[PDB]
Design a binder for this molecule. Structure first.
Ligand SMILES: [Mg+2]
Ligand SMILES: [Mg+2]
Ligand SMILES: [Mg+2]
Ligand SMILES: [Mg+2]
Ligand SMILES: [Mg+2]
Ligand SMILES: [Mg+2]
Ligand SMILES: [Mg+2]
Ligand SMILES: [Mg+2]
Ligand SMILES: [Mg+2]
Ligand SMILES: [Mg+2]
Ligand SMILES: [Mg+2]
Ligand SMILES: [Mg+2]
Ligand SMILES: [Mg+2]
Ligand SMILES: [Mg+2]
Ligand SMILES: [Mg+2]
Ligand SMILES: [Mg+2]
Ligand SMILES: [Mg+2]
Ligand SMILES: [Mg+2]
Ligand SMILES: [Mg+2]
Ligand SMILES: [Mg+2]
Ligand SMILES: [Mg+2]
Ligand SMILES: [Mg+2]
Ligand SMILES: [Mg+2]
Ligand SMILES: [Mg+2]
Ligand SMILES: [Mg+2]
Ligand SMILES: [Mg+2]
Ligand SMILES: [Mg+2]
Ligand SMILES: [Mg+2]
Ligand SMILES: [Mg+2]
Ligand SMILES: [Mg+2]
Ligand SMILES: [Mg+2]
Ligand SMILES: [Mg+2]
Ligand SMILES: [Mg+2]
Ligand SMILES: [Mg+2]
Ligand SMILES: [Mg+2]
Ligand SMILES: [Mg+2]
Ligand SMILES: [Mg+2]
Ligand SMILES: [Mg+2]
Ligand SMILES: [Mg+2]
Ligand SMILES: [Mg+2]
Ligand SMILES: [Mg+2]
Ligand SMILES: [Mg+2]
Ligand SMILES: [Mg+2]
Ligand SMILES: [Mg+2]
Ligand SMILES: [Mg+2]
Lengths: 123, 125, 209, 114, 56
RNA sequence: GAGGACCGAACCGACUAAUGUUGAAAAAUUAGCGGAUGACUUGUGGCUGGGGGUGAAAGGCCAAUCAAACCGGGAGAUAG
RNA sequence: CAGGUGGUCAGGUAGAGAAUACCAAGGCGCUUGAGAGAACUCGGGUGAAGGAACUAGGCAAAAUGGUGCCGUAACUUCGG
RNA sequence: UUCCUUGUCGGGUAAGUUCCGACCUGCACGAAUGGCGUAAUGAUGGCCAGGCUGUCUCCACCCGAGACUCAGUGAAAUUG
RNA sequence: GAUGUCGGCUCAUCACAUCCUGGGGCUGAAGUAGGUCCCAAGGGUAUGGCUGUUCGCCAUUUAAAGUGGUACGCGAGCUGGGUUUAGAACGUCGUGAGACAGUUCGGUCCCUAUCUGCCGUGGGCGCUGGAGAACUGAGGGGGGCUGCUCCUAGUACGAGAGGACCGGAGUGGACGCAUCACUGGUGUUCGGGUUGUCAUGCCAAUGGCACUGCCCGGUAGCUAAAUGCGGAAGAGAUAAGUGCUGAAAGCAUCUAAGCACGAAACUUGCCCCGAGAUGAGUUCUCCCUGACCCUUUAAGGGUCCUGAAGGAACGUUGAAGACGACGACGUUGAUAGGCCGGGUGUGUAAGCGCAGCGAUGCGUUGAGCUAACCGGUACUAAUGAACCGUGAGGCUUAACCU
């Protein structure tokens, strides 16, 4: 349940540490973005020598939320923080090469198979 | 909305309601019949009758628990020594609400509420 | 096709063996007994009138009792009509069971929604609340403007205002039939249906696809 | 009512083990990835239990790869294959929600030692 | 907000057409004392359904 | 043990908001706010009088009254 | 008539305290009540995820809050 | 204090008619109707950040006082 | 002898000179994508940064971010930033008092709704004997949005790059309705922890007050962020448009006679209201089958007898509700309370024993308590009555029976 102005942690090694969602993509008046949704972000804090720098405007896919995901049997999977993975602004491919922390199977799609294959744990 | 909710507010806050019904329950078991408004009388049933059910099993735990609900040892004594044995065989319904006229000062619907076994032999004590 | 009159028992869930929880509404559908058949000749339209449930003989009036005695059925808790489609034939006194929905896939459930009483415009029409602070004076949940200046000089009919909400007839369409339990007079539909627990429901096959 | 409880008791599992809040359990769930279906384990602390018959549930919390994860299971769902208690904890409360604010040595739970 | 014209005595009487009181339909008669009383209420002397329930 | 020193009650004040606006009140209440040993505050009594007083100065205040108080008189001013 | 009105008296427990909380001595329940438990208004409590995106403006609210010890920058009129 | 004007450049922001730094083209700064600096101070003006939050996305529930019903009393502005 | 004046907020409504979606003609239209014009108003039609701003610029979206009217819609609905009093200052003008759509800081937004209107909800009477139900549907309202992916097909088209129509499937956004099984929120009526203090003689145990004292959990109910469903298909008549046959006019010609297509618009189809539809409809069932007098002799008045069906009232009440209303029930009774059992929540009561110098710990013990929940149970309260409502229901004509 991510909206604009929401700060997210970064679950990859692209160099960013804190990003802020500036737009929930995919529909007019769209309010929230859950796990698996693409968002437009700006980088609020980065490491000194990463692949990205503070101020860039990219896209990201949400991989962990405190609100959590709902499974078809009614189960919930909540996380302690919101996290995303930075994507190329036009190619929608992950920028980093590693993934930290677990992800969910909502990402199990040919578009994010690169993320599923790199994740340390899929829930 | 009020769906399935129980308990009347009686235009009081929670602490006032609790104190009032505590006093009114003590007065009921002391005199075995009192006169009050019909709404107050109907809510008093859900307070005093659980005390009588509690008083059927004499024990220091029940006595203390009854004391916590009434805060009057004279009331607790009568509950466990008189009203307990008197209702040992009755399964609930220890009170009786008899509607009467309207209060002169504010036209409030009044009602008597009494213990059911307040017979002609109650004059002994 | 005709429908049936049941009672909302409540909501539960059905676990599918492949690990899916289906929220279902349990509808008790006892035998619906046909009490009157209307035809084009005598009434100008084809329909059946059914009753269901039971009723204490001391609560039925002589006009109602004579209506049930005319049909030869026991008095139920009410009467409902169903327009007959071309080809459906029913006789008075005939009983209709829940197994009529054996092959029906989707149904429309009609009931009386729960009553909210007098509801404000925020609850009834999803109006936006005005500012809670920033100087707002006694105007937090009020509807705001209700018209234009002198040119119309009136409030248009159908304006959304506060008033009675709920406690009205509501139909939910195209609900999947999860299970038809004939021997227990049960009908499990996926989803939620209008009304409180114990209210009467009218279940008809889906008029749409 | 008698009707609904009759429909629910015929779906409930009959061998769900007894566990309390504070015990560490290992839940094995069914993960379907197409034509396969394997068992994925999920071990952690039971921080809440909802007793509602068929609608009963319990939420397990674990620290996975530095990230805290809570998962609410529907105990009578066929997705949950089995439940095994690893160690029994000794807590005073029924809902261990305060464990969300603690970590490392602060999130330790005494063993019940029964 | 206030009236722009004085309402008439006719309009005033129409509004009060619903203000009429409803007298009690009929009083019950006690089986023992034969007194009249409001139904489901005790009598003036403390009788109800043929029983002296209060001795006052 | 100095201070137009600091924090903060009484006390004096009146910065913000809400309420109230045919008010509980012709200026308040509630929650916060400033000063709080001083150019402080307060009681009692006194003095300054209307083109006059007084004013750390706002044309402020001078009995709910002020770019000239109130009361009586000129006076039935005058009113294209 | 929720305003204003100088001085004197100053118990207990906790507390730095005449703050504050609960009590003593003592005095009161504020001169309409009774029900109900809609919208809406007022005064409050709590709130998933987000956290100023509100708005003229963080208005309001939330938050901070004590004692001891450690530690404390630019700048400085050497006191801060 | 600058009309043209949201001047231009730089900083801050994903985006800054405000803010900070500079430029000088000062419509119409300027030296006791003082010029330029200035630590401390401010219920002073502008701007930023952390924290914090029902300010908001988007409202939900709850506790009280009214509103509503019954009994008693009983106004007001306004009105061809 | 006052029509409150910008912008914002809330809430709108209409126009079409259409921003998107729909239908077309032409193209300097290969395809994709456009350009332009015609038809079309059903629905839809951003969030932010800056500024009082409308606007605009910018950032990032979207199928699209339409243009206008409505006292530049909307202050007896909100706001008060701007403008637009009194204070003060700058620049400027003036000898000066002062002045400046120049600038700057500060600066009281009242009204209990009579009428119309509107949203709800009742009372009366009517509908021609009365009553209880079930309907018909004249008419009215609601609803009508759209993305992306996949298949068709890397096909048609194209040098290549690229890349379809038509048709089908899935899955979203926004919006609406319903619901509470799930996930949660709330839960001052449930349980527990704890600070200060006062009290119950004291210990122990409890209670009061301190915002519910502060907190931690939490039942029912309500509820969204939760999860179900919805927008259609089809039909009729058409718009622009495309035609067939075909003369006037030996040809030609979509038109004059005739015939066929043709869109989210129209009329239906879907949902809701609906016989005060006074044009007051239909169907089924139920109830009433006494006398007598007067008079101006009639749709007359009166007395006695009679009081039905049913209704209302009263009571117990409800997931119904401001009040009315509506629903259930009233001993031939589960309507409410209580009670019994269960469930749920809280988390191992009190007392006692043991260990310890003690705080405390352990055992009895998943104990005790447990609201609104579930299943039972006449223990209490829903009374015999009384009340209202009558006694076969006008005239004319027609078809039928006598
Ligand atoms: Mg009251
Ligand atoms: Mg209701
Ligand atoms: Mg809003
Ligand atoms: Mg005001
Ligand atoms: Mg007109
Ligand atoms: Mg000082
Ligand atoms: Mg001070
Ligand atoms: Mg104050
Ligand atoms: Mg000071
Ligand atoms: Mg002046
Ligand atoms: Mg004065
Ligand atoms: Mg003269
Ligand atoms: Mg004169
Ligand atoms: Mg004083
Ligand atoms: Mg004090
Ligand atoms: Mg209330
Ligand atoms: Mg929150
Ligand atoms: Mg939170
Ligand atoms: Mg934050
Ligand atoms: Mg902003
Ligand atoms: Mg804004
Ligand atoms: Mg503030
Ligand atoms: Mg505060
Ligand atoms: Mg900002
Ligand atoms: Mg700003
Ligand atoms: Mg500058
Ligand atoms: Mg100067
Ligand atoms: Mg100077
Ligand atoms: Mg400053
Ligand atoms: Mg009155
Ligand atoms: Mg006038
Ligand atoms: Mg408009
Ligand atoms: Mg047009
Ligand atoms: Mg249409
Ligand atoms: Mg206007
Ligand atoms: Mg107006
Ligand atoms: Mg202003
Ligand atoms: Mg001035
Ligand atoms: Mg106003
Ligand atoms: Mg009028
Ligand atoms: Mg709940
Ligand atoms: Mg003690
Ligand atoms: Mg006390
Ligand atoms: Mg209290
Ligand atoms: Mg129990």
């Amino acid at each position: 349940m991510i909206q604009e102005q929401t700060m997210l942690n970064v679950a990859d090694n692209s160099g960013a540490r804190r990003v802020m969602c500036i737009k929930v993509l995919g529909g007019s008046h769209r309010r929230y973005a859950g796990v698996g949704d693409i968002i437009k972000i700006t980088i609020k804090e980065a490491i000194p020598r990463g692949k990205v720098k503070k101020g860039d405007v990219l896209k990201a896919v949400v991989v962990r939320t405190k609100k959590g995901v709902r499974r078809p049997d009614g189960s919930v999977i909540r996380f302690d923080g919101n996290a995303c993975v930075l994507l190329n602004n036009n190619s929608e491919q992950p920028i980093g090469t590693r993934i930290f922390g677990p992800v969910t199977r909502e990402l199990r799609s040919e578009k994010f198979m690169k993320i599923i294959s790199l994740a340390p744990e899929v829930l | 909305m009020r769906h399935r909710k129980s308990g009347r507010q009686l235009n009081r806050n929670s602490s006032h309601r609790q104190a009032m019904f505590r006093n009114m329950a003590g007065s009921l078991v002391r005199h075995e019949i009192i006169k009050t408004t019909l709404p107050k009388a109907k809510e008093l049933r859900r307070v005093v009758e659980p005390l009588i059910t509690l008083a059927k099993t004499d024990s220091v735990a029940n006595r203390r628990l009854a004391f916590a609900r009434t805060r009057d040892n004279e009331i607790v004594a009568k509950l466990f020594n008189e009203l307990g044995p008197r209702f040992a065989s009755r399964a609930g319904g220890y009170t009786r609400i008899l509607k009467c006229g309207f209060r002169a000062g504010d036209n409030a619907p009044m009602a008597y509420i009494e213990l059911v076994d307040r017979s002609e032999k109650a004059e002994a004590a | 096709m005709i429908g049936l009159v049941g009672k909302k028992v409540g909501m539960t869930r059905i676990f599918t063996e492949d690990g899916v929880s289906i929220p279902v509404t349990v509808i008790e559908v006892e035998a619906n007994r046909v009490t009157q058949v209307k035809d084009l000749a005598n009434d100008g339209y084809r329909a059946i009138q059914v009753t269901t449930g039971a009723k204490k003989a001391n609560r039925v009036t002589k006009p109602e009792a004579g209506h049930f005695a005319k049909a030869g059925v026991e008095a139920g808790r009410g009467l409902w009509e169903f327009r007959l489609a071309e080809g459906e034939e029913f006789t008075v006194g005939q009983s209709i069971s829940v197994e009529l929905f054996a092959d029906v896939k989707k149904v429309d459930v009609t009931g009386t929604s729960k009553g909210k009483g007098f509801a404000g415009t925020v609850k009834r029409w999803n109006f936006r609340t005005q500012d809670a602070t920033h100087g707002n004076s006694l105007s937090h949940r009020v509807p705001g403007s209700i018209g234009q200046n002198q040119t119309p000089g009136k409030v248009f009919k159908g304006k959304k205002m506060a008033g009675q909400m709920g406690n009205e007839r509501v139909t939910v369409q195209s609900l999947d039939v999860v299970r038809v339990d004939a021997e227990r007079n049960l009908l499990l539909v996926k989803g939620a249906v209008p009304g409180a627990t114990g209210s009467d429901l009218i279940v008809k096959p889906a008029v749409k696809a | 009512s008698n009707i609904i409880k009759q429909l629910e008791q015929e779906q409930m599992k009959q061998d769900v083990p007894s566990f309390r809040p504070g015990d560490t359990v290992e839940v094995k769930v069914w993960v379907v990835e197409g034509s396969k279906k394997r068992l994925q384990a999920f071990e952690g602390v039971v921080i809440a239990i909802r007793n509602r018959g068929l609608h009963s549930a319990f939420t397990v919390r674990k620290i996975s790869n530095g990230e805290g994860v809570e998962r609410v299971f529907q105990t009578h769902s066929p997705v949950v294959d089995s439940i095994s208690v690893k160690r029994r904890g000794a807590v005073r409360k029924a809902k261990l929600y305060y464990l969300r604010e603690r970590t490392g040595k602060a999130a330790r739970i005494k063993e019940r030692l029964n | 907000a206030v009236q722009q014209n004085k309402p008439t005595r006719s309009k005033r009487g129409m509004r009060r057409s619903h203000d009429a009181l409803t007298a009690v339909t009929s009083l019950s008669v006690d089986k023992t004392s034969g007194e009249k009383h409001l139904r489901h209420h005790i009598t003036a002397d403390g009788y109800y359904r043929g029983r002296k329930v209060i001795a006052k």
